[PDB]
Design an enzyme around this catalytic site. Structure first.
Site, short mmCIF file in Angstrom:
data_model
loop_
_atom_site.label_atom_id
_atom_site.label_comp_id
_atom_site.label_asym_id
_atom_site.label_seq_id
_atom_site.Cartn_x
_atom_site.Cartn_y
_atom_site.Cartn_z
N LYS A 116 8.09 11.31 -4.27
CA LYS A 116 8.81 10.07 -3.71
C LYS A 116 10.12 10.59 -3.12
O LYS A 116 10.71 11.40 -3.49
CB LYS A 116 8.72 9.11 -4.60
CG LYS A 116 7.38 8.21 -5.09
CD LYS A 116 7.32 6.89 -4.99
CE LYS A 116 5.95 6.33 -5.60
NZ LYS A 116 4.72 6.75 -4.53
N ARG A 124 0.56 8.86 -12.42
CA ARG A 124 -0.19 8.99 -11.26
C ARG A 124 0.46 10.23 -10.46
O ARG A 124 1.70 10.21 -10.23
CB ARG A 124 -0.02 7.75 -10.37
CG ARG A 124 -0.65 7.71 -9.05
CD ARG A 124 -0.76 6.45 -8.35
NE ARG A 124 -1.42 6.38 -7.14
CZ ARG A 124 -0.90 6.85 -6.17
NH1 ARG A 124 0.24 7.36 -6.07
NH2 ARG A 124 -1.69 6.79 -4.93
#
Ligand SMILES: Nc1ccc(C(=O)O)cc1
Lengths: 257, 245
Positions: free
Chosen positions: A204, A239
């Site tokens: 991210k 995740r």
């Protein structure tokens, strides 16, 4: 503590990994088999991008085909969709977990989860739309607000019959670096709500900003670092994209902490 | 905050500092400027189980640490400019204690049951490894300082005369070694401990387990890390230090 997976229970006495299997264009069985081999405990399949935003109305031909195939591996499969329409078909084929980015705001999603006896992940997103979420990346007190939202949605889902709810802060979803840092530093407060907690910072923007890595594909080291910090805060569900890297890091971390 | 004395300057330990490894054992100093570019704070050179390269690398202006058992080598290294002396024998030889205090350079005191690596694994039978390592480090440090050494850095010596059980015990109570008041250095890069815990047989492919072990050490208070993959650690620390602090 355990995580209900439709017809089996996964113990959270050690960190469990959800291997991401993106079913979209730009950023199955073969890779799914590889992630299983690398140590993935759950396979998370998504056919619609929630990146900060192309809506796809009939994504059934994208997901269901791979899903049915992947489910033949015998490993629990998490379905990432915000459409009740898609979820129903996913759950009927065998899905074990429903991952809804819109935070179970849709009663139809709650009803379905409850009907099929499947746990649901409640993720926070300031607004139900990924195309304008970043446009609403402003909070009076992000931690307090995300906590209140997660708890309220979880309560709503449980009282409706959903067997269990997994909370996900939704890092990067309508959140700037400062908001992600705040949530990470006080993540223990979300873990203290009593529900299993799931987080995903793999590749991210926040990882890029903190590690100084321009290419999202080369952010594994900053991602592993963020995730180990989350594990230290009590998170037991991650995740991730690089399954092997995390299994190797956790082998060390869990033996030490 | 605390600092690390490096012959002619002090390095702030307000954040984790990296000693990038440059082994010259069985030329182009590219790897040198490459490691500095990757984020290495100190360059660690060792040709044991040198001088020409040491002189070349030193011209980069970056602090250089030298690894040797032989005082003859240390002297010539210090005379050329080396900023840190890393004695992989516990600093048992008073001859290199003398060299450090004379060149006014800090010295690393690494623990190992015995000096000889060929037989140290036959001396991995501690009644209480943490207590004994702490006692040894403190004693060697107390001696080096009284002799004039400006500063001592302590290293638990992971993988030196230690079973997995010992390495685990030391890592889990690392905060107790940091509590001795001296800067602490740890080096678990590519070590057997990492291979065992992460399930990676090839030493060159142990970066992820090494980063994890080092972040754990940082959490315990260590601010000096001896590493092979400088970039991987700088990237991980960028995230870790922003979060955990
Ligand atoms: N779906 C998402 C993908 C990436 C990011 C992010 O980098 O912040 C956020 C959401």
């Amino acid at each position: 503590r355990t995580l209900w997976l439709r017809d089996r229970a996964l113990d959270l006495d050690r960190v469990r990994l959800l291997g991401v299997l993106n079913l979209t264009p730009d950023s199955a069985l073969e890779r799914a088999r590889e992630m299983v081999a690398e140590g993935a405990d759950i396979l998370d399949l998504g056919a619609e991008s929630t990146r900060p935003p192309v809506p796809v109305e009939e994504e059934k031909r994208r997901l269901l085909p791979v899903l049915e195939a992947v489910l033949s591996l015998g490993v629990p499969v998490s379905v990432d969709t915000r459409k009740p329409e898609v979820a129903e078909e996913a759950l009927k084929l065998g899905a074990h977990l429903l991952n809804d980015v819109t935070g179970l705001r849709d009663e139809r999603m709650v009803a379905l989860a409850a009907r099929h006896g499947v746990a649901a992940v409640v993720m926070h997103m300031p607004v139900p739309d990924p195309a304008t979420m970043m446009a609403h990346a402003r909070y009076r007190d992000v931690v307090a607000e995300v906590k209140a939202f997660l708890e309220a949605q979880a309560r709503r889902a449980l009282s409706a019959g959903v067997p269990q709810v997994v909370l996900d802060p939704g890092f990067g979803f309508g959140k700037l670096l400062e908001h992600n840092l705040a949530l990470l530093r006080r993540l223990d407060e979300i873990v203290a709500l009593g529900h299993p907690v799931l987080v995903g910072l793999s590749r991210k923007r926040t990882i890029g900003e903190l590690s100084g890595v321009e290419d999202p594909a080369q952010r594994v080291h900053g991602s592993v670092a963020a995730h180990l910090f989350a594990v230290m805060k009590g998170v037991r569900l991650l995740r991730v994209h690089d399954v092997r890297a995390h299994r190797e890091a956790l082998g060390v971390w869990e033996a030490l902490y």
